[PDB]
Tab-separated table of C-alpha atoms in Angstrom:
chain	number	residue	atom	x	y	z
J	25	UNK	CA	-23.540	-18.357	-25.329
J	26	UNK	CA	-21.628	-21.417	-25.784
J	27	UNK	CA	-18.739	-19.859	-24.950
J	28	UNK	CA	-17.767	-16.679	-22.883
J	29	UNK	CA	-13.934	-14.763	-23.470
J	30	UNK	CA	-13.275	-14.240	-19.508
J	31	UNK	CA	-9.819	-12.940	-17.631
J	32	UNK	CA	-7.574	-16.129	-16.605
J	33	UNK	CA	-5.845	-14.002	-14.195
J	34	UNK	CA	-6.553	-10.955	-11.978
J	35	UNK	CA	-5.250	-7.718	-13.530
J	36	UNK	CA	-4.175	-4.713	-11.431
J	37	UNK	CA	-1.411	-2.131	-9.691
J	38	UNK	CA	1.427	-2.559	-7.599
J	39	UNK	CA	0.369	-0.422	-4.372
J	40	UNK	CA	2.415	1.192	-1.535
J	41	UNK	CA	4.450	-1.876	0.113
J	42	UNK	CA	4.725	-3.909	-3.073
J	43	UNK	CA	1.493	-5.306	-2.786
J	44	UNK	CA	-1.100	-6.160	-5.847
J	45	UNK	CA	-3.939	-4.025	-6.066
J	46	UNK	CA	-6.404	-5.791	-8.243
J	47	UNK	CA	-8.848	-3.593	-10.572
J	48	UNK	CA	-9.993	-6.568	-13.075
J	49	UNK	CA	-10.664	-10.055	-11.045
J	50	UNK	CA	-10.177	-13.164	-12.136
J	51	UNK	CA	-12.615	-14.725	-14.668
J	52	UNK	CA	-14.338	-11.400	-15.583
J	53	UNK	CA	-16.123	-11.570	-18.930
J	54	UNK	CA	-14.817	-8.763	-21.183
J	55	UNK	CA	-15.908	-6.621	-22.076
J	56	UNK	CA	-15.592	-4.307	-18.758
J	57	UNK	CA	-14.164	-1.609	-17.294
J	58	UNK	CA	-13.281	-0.589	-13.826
J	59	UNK	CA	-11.948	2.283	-11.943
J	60	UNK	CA	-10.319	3.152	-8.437
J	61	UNK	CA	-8.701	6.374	-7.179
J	62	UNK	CA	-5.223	6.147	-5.291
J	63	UNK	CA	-3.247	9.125	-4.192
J	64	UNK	CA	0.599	9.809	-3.000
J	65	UNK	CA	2.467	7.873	-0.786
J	66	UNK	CA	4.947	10.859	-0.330
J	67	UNK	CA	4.688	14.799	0.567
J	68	UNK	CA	5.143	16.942	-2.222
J	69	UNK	CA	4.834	13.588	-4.559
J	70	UNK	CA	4.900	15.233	-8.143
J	71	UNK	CA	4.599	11.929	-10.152
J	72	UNK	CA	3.172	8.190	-9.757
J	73	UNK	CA	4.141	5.209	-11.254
J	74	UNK	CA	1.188	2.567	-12.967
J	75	UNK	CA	2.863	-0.585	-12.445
J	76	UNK	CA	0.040	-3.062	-14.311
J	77	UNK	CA	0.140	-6.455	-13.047
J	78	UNK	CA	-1.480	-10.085	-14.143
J	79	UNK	CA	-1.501	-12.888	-11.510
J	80	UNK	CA	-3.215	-13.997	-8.293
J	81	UNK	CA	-0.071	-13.483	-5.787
J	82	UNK	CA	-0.433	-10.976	-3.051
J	83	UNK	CA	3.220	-9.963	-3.365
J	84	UNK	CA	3.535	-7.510	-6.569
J	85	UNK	CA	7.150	-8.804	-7.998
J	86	UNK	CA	5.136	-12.092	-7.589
J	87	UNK	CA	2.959	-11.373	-10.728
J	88	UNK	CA	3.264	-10.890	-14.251
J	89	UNK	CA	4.246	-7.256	-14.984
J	90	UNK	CA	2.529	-6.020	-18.254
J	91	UNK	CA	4.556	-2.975	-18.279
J	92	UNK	CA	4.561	0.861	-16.281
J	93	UNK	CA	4.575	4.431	-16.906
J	94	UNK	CA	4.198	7.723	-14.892
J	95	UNK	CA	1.894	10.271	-14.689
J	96	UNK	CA	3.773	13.365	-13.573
J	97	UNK	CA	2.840	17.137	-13.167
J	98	UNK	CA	0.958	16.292	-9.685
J	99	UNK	CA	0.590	19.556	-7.595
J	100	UNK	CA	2.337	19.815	-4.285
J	101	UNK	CA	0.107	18.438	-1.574
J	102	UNK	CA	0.467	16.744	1.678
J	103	UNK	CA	0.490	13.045	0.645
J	104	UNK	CA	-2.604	10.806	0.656
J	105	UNK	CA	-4.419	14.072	-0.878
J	106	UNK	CA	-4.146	14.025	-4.577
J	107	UNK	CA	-7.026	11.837	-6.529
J	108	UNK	CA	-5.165	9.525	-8.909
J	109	UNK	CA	-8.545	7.741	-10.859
J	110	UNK	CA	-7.290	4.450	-12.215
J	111	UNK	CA	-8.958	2.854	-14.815
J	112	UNK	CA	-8.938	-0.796	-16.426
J	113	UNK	CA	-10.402	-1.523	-19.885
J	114	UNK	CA	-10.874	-4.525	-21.803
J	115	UNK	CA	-12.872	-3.848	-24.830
J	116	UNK	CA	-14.493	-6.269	-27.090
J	117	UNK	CA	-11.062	-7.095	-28.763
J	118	UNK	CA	-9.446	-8.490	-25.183
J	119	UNK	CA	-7.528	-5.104	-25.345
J	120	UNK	CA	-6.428	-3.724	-21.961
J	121	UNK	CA	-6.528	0.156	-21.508
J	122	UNK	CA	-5.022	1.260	-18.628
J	123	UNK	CA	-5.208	5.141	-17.432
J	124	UNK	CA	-3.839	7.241	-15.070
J	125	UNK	CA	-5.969	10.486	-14.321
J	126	UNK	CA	-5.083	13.765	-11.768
J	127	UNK	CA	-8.313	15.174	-10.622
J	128	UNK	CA	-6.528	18.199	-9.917
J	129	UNK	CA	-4.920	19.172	-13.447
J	130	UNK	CA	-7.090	16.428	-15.114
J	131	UNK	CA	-4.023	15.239	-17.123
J	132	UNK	CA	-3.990	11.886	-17.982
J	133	UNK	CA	-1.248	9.060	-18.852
J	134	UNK	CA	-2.172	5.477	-20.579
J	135	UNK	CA	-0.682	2.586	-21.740
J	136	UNK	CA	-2.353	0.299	-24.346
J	137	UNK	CA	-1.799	-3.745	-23.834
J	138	UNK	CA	-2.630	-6.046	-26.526
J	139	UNK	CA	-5.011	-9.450	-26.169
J	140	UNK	CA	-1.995	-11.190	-26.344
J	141	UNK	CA	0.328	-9.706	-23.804
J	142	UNK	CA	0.848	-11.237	-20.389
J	143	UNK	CA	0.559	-15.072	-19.331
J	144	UNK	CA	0.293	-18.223	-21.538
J	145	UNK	CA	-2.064	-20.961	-21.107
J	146	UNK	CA	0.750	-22.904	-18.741
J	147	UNK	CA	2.057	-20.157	-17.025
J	148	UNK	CA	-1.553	-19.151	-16.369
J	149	UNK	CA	-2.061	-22.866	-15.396
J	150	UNK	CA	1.557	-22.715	-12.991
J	151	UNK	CA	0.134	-19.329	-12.014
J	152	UNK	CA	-2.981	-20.585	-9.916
J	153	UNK	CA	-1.116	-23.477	-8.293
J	154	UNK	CA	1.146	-21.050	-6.770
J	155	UNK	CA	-0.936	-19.049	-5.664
J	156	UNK	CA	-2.722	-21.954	-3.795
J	157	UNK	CA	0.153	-23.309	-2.890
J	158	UNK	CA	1.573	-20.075	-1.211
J	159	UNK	CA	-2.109	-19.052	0.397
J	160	UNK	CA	-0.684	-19.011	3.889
J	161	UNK	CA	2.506	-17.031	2.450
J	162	UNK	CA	0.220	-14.099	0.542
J	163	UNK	CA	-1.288	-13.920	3.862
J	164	UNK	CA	1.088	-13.009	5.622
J	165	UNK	CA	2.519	-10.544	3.324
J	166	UNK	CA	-0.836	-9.005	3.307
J	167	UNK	CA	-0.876	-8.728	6.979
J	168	UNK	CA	3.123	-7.219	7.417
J	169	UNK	CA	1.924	-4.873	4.646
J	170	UNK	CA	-0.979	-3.786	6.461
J	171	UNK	CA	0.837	-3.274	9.778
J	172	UNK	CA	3.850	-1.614	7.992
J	173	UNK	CA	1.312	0.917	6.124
J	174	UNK	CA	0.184	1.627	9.732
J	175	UNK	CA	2.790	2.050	11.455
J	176	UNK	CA	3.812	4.660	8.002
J	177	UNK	CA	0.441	6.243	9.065
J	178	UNK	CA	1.371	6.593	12.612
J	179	UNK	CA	4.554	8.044	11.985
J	180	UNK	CA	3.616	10.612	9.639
J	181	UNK	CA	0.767	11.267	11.623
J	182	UNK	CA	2.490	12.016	14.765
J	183	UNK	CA	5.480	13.899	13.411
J	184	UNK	CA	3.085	16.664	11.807
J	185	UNK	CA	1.066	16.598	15.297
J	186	UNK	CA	4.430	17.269	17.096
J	187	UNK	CA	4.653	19.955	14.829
J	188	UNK	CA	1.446	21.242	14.846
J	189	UNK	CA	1.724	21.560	18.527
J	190	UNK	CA	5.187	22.981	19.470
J	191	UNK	CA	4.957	25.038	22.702
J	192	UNK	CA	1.831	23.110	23.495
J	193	UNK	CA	3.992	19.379	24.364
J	194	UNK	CA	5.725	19.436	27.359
J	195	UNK	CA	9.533	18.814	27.093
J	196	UNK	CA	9.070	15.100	29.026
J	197	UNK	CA	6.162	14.190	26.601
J	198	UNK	CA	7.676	15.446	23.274
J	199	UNK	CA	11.695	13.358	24.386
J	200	UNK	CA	9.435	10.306	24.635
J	201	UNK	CA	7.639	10.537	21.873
J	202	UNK	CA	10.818	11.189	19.175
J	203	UNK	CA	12.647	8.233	20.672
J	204	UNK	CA	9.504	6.165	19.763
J	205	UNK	CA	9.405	7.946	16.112
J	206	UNK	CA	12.932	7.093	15.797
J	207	UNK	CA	12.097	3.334	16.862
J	208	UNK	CA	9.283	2.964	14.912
J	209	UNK	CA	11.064	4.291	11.892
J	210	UNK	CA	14.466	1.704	12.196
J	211	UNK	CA	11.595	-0.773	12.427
J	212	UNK	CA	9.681	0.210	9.351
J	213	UNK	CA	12.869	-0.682	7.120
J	214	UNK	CA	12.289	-4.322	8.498
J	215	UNK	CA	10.682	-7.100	8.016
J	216	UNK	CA	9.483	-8.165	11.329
J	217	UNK	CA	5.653	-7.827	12.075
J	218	UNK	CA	6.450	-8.305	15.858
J	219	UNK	CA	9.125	-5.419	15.747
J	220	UNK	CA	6.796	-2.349	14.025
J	221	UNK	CA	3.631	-3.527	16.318
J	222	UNK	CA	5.673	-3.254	19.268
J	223	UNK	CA	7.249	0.270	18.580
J	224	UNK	CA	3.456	1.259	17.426
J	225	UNK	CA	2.651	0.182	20.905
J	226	UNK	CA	5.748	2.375	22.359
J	227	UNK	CA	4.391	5.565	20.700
J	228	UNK	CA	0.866	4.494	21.627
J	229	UNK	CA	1.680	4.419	25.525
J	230	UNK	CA	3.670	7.863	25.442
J	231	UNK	CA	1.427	10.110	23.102
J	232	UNK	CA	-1.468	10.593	24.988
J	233	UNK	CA	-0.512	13.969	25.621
J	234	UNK	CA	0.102	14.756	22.109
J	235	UNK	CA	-3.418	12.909	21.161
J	236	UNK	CA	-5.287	15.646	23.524
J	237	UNK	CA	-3.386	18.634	22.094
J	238	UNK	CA	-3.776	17.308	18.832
J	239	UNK	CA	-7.530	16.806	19.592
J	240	UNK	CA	-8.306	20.127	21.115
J	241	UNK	CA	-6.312	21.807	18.742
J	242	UNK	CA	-8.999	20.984	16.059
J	243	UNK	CA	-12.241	20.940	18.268
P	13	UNK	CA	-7.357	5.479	0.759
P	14	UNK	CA	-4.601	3.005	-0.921
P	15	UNK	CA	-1.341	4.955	-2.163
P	16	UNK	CA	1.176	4.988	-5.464
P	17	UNK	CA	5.156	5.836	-5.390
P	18	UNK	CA	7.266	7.544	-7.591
P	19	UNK	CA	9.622	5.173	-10.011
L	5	UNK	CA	-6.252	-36.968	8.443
L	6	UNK	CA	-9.653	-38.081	6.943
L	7	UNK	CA	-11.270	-35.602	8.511
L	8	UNK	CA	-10.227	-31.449	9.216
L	9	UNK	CA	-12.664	-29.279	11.506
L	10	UNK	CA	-12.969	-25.931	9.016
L	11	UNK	CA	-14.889	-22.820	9.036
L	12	UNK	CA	-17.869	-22.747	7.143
L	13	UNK	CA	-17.958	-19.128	6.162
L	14	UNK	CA	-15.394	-16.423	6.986
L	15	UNK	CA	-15.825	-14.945	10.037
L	16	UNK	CA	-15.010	-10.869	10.815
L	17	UNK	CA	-16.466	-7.255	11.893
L	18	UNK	CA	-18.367	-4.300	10.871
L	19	UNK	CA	-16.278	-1.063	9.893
L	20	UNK	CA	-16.764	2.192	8.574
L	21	UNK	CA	-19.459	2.129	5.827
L	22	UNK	CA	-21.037	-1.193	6.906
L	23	UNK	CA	-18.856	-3.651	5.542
L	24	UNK	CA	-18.052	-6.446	6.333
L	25	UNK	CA	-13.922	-6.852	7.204
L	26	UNK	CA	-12.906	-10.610	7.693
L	27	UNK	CA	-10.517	-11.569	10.251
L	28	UNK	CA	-10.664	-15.483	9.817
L	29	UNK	CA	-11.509	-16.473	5.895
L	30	UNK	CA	-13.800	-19.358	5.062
L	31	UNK	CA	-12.263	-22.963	4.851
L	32	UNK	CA	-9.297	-22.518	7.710
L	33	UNK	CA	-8.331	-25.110	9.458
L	34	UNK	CA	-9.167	-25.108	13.378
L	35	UNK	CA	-7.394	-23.901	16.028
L	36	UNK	CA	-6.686	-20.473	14.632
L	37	UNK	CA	-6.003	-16.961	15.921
L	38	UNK	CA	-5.901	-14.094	13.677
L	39	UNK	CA	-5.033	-10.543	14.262
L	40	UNK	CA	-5.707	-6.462	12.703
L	41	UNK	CA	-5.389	-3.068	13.999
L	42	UNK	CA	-8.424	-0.885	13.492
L	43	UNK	CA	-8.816	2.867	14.722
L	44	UNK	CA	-11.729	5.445	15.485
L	45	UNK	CA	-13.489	6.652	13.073
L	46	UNK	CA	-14.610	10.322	14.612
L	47	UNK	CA	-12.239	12.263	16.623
L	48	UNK	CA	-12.397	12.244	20.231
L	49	UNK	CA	-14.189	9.055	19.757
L	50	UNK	CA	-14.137	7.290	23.353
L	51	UNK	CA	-15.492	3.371	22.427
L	52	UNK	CA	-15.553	1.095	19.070
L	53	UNK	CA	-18.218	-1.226	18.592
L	54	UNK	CA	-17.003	-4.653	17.630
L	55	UNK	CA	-20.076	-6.105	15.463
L	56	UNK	CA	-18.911	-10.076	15.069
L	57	UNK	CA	-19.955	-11.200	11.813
L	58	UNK	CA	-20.697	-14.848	9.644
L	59	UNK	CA	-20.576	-15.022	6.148
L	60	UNK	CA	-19.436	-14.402	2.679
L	61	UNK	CA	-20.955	-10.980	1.694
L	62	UNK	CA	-19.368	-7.175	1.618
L	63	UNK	CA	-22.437	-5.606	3.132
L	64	UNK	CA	-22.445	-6.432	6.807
L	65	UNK	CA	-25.638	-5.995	7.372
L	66	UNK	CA	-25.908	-9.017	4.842
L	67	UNK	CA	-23.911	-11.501	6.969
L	68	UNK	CA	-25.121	-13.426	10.304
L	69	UNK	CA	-24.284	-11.423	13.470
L	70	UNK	CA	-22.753	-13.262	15.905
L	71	UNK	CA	-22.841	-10.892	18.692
L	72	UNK	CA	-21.601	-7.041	19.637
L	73	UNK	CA	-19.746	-5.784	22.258
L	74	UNK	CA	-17.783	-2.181	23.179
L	75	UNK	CA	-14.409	-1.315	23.888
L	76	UNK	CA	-14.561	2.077	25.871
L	77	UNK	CA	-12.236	4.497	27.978
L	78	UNK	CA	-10.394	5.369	24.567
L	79	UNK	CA	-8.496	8.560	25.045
L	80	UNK	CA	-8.966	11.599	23.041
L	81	UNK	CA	-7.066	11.821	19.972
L	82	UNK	CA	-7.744	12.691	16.423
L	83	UNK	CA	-9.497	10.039	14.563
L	84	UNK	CA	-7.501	7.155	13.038
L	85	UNK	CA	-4.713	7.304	15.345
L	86	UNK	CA	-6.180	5.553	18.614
L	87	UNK	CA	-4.670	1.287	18.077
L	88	UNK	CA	-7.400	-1.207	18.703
L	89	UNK	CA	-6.127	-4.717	18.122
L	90	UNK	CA	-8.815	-6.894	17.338
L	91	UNK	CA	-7.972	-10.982	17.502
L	92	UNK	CA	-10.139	-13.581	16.070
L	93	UNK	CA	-9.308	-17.050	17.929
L	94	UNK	CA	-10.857	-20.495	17.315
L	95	UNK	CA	-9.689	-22.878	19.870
L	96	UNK	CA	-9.860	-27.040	19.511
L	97	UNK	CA	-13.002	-27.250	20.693
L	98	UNK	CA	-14.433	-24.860	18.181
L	99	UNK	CA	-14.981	-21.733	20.800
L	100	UNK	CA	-14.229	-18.413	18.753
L	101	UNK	CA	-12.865	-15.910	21.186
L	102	UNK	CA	-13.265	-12.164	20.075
L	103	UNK	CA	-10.849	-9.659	21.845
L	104	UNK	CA	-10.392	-5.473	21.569
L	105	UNK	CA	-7.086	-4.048	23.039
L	106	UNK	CA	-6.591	-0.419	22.999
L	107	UNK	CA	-2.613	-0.372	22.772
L	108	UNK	CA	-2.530	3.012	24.792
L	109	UNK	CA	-3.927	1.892	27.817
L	110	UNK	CA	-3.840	-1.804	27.577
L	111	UNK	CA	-7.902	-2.125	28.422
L	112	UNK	CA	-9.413	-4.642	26.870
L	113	UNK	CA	-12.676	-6.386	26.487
L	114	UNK	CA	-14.020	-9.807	24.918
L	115	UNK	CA	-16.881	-11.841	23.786
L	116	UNK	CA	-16.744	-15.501	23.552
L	117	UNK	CA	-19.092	-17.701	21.343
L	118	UNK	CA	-20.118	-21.128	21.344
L	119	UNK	CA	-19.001	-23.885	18.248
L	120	UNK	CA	-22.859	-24.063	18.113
L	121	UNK	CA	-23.436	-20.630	17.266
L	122	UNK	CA	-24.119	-19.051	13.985
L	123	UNK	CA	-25.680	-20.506	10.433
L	124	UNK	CA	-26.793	-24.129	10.163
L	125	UNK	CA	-25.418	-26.205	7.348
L	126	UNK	CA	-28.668	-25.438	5.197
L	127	UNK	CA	-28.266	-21.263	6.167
L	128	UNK	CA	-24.546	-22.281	5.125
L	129	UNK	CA	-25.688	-23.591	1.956
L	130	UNK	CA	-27.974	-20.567	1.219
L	131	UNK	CA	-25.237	-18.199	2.029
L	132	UNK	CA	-22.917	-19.440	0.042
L	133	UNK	CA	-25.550	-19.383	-2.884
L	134	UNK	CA	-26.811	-15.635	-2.182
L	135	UNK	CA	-23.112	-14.105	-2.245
L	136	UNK	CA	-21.971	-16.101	-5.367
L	137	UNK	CA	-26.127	-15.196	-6.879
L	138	UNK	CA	-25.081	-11.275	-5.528
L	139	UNK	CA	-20.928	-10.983	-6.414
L	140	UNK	CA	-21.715	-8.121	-8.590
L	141	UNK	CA	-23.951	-6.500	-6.485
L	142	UNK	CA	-21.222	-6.651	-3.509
L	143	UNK	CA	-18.796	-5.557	-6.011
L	144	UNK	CA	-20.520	-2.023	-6.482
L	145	UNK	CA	-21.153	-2.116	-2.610
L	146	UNK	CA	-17.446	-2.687	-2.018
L	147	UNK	CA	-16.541	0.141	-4.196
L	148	UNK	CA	-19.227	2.764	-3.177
L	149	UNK	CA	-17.366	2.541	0.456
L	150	UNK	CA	-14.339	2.913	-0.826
L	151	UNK	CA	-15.868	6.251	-2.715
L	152	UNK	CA	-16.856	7.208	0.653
L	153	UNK	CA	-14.556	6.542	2.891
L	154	UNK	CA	-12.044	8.143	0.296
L	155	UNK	CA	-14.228	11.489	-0.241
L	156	UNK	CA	-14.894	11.422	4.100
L	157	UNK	CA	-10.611	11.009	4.079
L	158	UNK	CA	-10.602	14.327	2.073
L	159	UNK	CA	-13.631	16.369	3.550
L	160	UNK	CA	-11.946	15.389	7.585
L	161	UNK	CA	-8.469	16.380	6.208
L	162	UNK	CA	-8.990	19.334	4.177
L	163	UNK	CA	-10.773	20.719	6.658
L	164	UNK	CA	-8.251	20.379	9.071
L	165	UNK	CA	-5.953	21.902	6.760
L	166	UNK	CA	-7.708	24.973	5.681
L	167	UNK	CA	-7.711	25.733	10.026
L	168	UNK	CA	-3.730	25.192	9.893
L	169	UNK	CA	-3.861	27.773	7.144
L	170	UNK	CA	-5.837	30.140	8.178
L	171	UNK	CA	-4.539	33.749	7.193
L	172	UNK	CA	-1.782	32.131	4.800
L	173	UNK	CA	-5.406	31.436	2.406
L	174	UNK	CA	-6.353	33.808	0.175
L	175	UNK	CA	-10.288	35.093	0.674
L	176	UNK	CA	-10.947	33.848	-2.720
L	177	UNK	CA	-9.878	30.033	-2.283
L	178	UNK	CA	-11.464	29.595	1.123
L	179	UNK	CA	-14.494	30.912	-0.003
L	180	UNK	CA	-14.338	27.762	-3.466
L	181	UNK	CA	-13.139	25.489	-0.892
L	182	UNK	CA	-15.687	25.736	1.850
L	183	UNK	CA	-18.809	25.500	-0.583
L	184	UNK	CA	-17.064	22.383	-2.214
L	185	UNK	CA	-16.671	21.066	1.452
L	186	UNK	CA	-20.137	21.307	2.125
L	187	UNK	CA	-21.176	19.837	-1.095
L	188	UNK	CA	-18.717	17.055	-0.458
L	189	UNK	CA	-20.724	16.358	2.975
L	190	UNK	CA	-24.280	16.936	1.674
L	191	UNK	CA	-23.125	14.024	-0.892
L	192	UNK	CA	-21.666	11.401	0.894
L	193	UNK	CA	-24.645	11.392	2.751
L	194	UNK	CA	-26.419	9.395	-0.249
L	195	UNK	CA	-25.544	6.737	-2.140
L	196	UNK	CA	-24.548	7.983	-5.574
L	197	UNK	CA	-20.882	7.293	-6.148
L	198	UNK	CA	-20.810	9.394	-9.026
L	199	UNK	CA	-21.988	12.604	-7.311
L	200	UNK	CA	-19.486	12.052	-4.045
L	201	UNK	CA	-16.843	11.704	-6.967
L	202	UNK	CA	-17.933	14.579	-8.460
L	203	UNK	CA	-17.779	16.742	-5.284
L	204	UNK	CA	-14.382	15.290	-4.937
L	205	UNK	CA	-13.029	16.368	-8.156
L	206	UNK	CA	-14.157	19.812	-7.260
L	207	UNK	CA	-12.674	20.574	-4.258
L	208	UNK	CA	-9.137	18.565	-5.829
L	209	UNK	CA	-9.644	21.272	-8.431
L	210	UNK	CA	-9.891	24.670	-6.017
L	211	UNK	CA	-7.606	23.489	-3.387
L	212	UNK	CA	-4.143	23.633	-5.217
L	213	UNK	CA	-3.717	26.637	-3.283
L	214	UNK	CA	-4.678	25.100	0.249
L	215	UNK	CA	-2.449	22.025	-0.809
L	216	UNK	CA	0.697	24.137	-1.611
L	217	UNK	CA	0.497	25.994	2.213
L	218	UNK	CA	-0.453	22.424	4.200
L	219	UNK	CA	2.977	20.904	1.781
L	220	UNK	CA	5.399	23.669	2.973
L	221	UNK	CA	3.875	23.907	6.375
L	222	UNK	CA	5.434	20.665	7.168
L	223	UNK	CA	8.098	20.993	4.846
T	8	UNK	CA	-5.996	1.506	8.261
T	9	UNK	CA	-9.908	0.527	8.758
T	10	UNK	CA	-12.291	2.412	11.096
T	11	UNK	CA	-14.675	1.407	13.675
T	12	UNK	CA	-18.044	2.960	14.469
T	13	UNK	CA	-19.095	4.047	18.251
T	14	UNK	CA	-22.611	2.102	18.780
């Protein structure tokens, strides 16, 4: 009561486009526990990496790492389908549980972090200055991220559509839309915001054919 | 729907 | 220099699940323009609803509406996939401009509002108070939606999935998958994360058949 | 990738 054990720092996972996913925020009194299910970034994914993390930067490499470990055996599966539950817990002893869960198989990975791991009081201290200090930075980041995580969507997206509908796309349509899949993936290896959105835009403008096939073929 | 790679 | 013209509160939309998504955060500096990319949320949909919000909580429908407006003529196309950019921009005088694109067809539509619009400095005041009085509260909120939108993700998917199957699915599997789809809808209709996870968990665990067919059928 | 609501 006169005092209340908190988290200096954010605690969390590095996430598809190496940005922090935070499970534990920042000043949370302990103890606590919190969960969140991810999934694959790739087809046919058969095991995910828990990178745990301790900081207030957007950018993942921009954090403390408190260490990583895989949870393998996940089933083949179109990606974005299996449920990976993630779970943070500090129990009364400021000790930090993290576990990786399948839904599918229901086996489970974890990695135990002592009270003392992670941060000192001055690196916790140069920690939150950066972090203000680089706002405008982390935003941006977050925003490329976003975009580039879009424009993965988009491709993906459209390349199993293209397949899905074969004889259905006529041969103008389909030459269009490749050369914009090809674009759009060059530009995905970038960094430039501009770039991706603009070869989204491309594939946007010639895949309306595609959209209605694609559309139909499931209505 | 936020995804995990394989390290 | 002694003085710097801010927002108040952060300023955004509605999306899927009600909550609030923030284009402009609270505290930036005037003139701004900020951009996202959103998408339908129902295939075939043919408008988006842009629902211009004030504030600092998760639950939109806990934040000061600012004004709606629609974006229509969007082509048919699965869900997700249709590219509606969405730009927040504050001029010098304090006028927030609201614009939809649809990056297919280039239509767009806006909504301007007056500097004058919005909370007062004491509804200001009380907002601030009622989301730091209500951060846990928005907390579970925040991660309800992400339940649902997650389990919605895998009901809209799988059941594309088992149609791309069709014959390749054993009787037996459909038949699991099916009741666990149904299940999975009757429960995202409430409000009970733990029972949409639970219907989630069930259909992960009877559709490692369905999972291995939509894998090597675009593979 | 966030969703928007026909209203």
């Amino acid at each position: 009561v006169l005092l209340l054990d908190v988290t200096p720092l954010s605690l969390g996972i590095e996430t598809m486009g190496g940005v922090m996913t935070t499970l534990i925020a920042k000043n949370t009194t302990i103890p606590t526990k919190h969960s969140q299910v991810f999934s694959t970034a790739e087809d046919n994914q058969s095991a995910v990496t828990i990178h745990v993390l301790q900081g207030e930067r957007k950018r993942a490499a921009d954090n403390k790492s408190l260490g990583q470990f895989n949870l393998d055996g996940i089933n083949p599966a179109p990606r974005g389908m299996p449920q990976i539950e993630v779970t943070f817990d500090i129990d009364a002893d400021g000790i930090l549980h993290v576990s990786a869960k399948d839904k599918n198989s229901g086996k489970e990975q974890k990695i135990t972090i002592k009270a003392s791991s992670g941060l000192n009081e001055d690196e916790i201290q140069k920690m939150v200055r950066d972090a203000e200090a680089n706002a405008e930075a982390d935003r941006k980041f977050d925003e490329l991220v976003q975009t580039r995580n879009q424009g993965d969507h988009l491709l993906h997206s459209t390349r199993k559509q293209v397949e899905e509908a074969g004889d259905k796309l006529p041969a103008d349509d389909k030459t269009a839309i490749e050369s914009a899949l090809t674009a759009l993936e060059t530009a995905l290896k970038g960094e430039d915001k501009a770039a991706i959105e603009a070869k989204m835009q491309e594939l946007a403008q010639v895949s309306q054919k595609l959209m209605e096939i694609a559309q139909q073929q499931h209505a | 729907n936020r995804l995990l790679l394989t390290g």
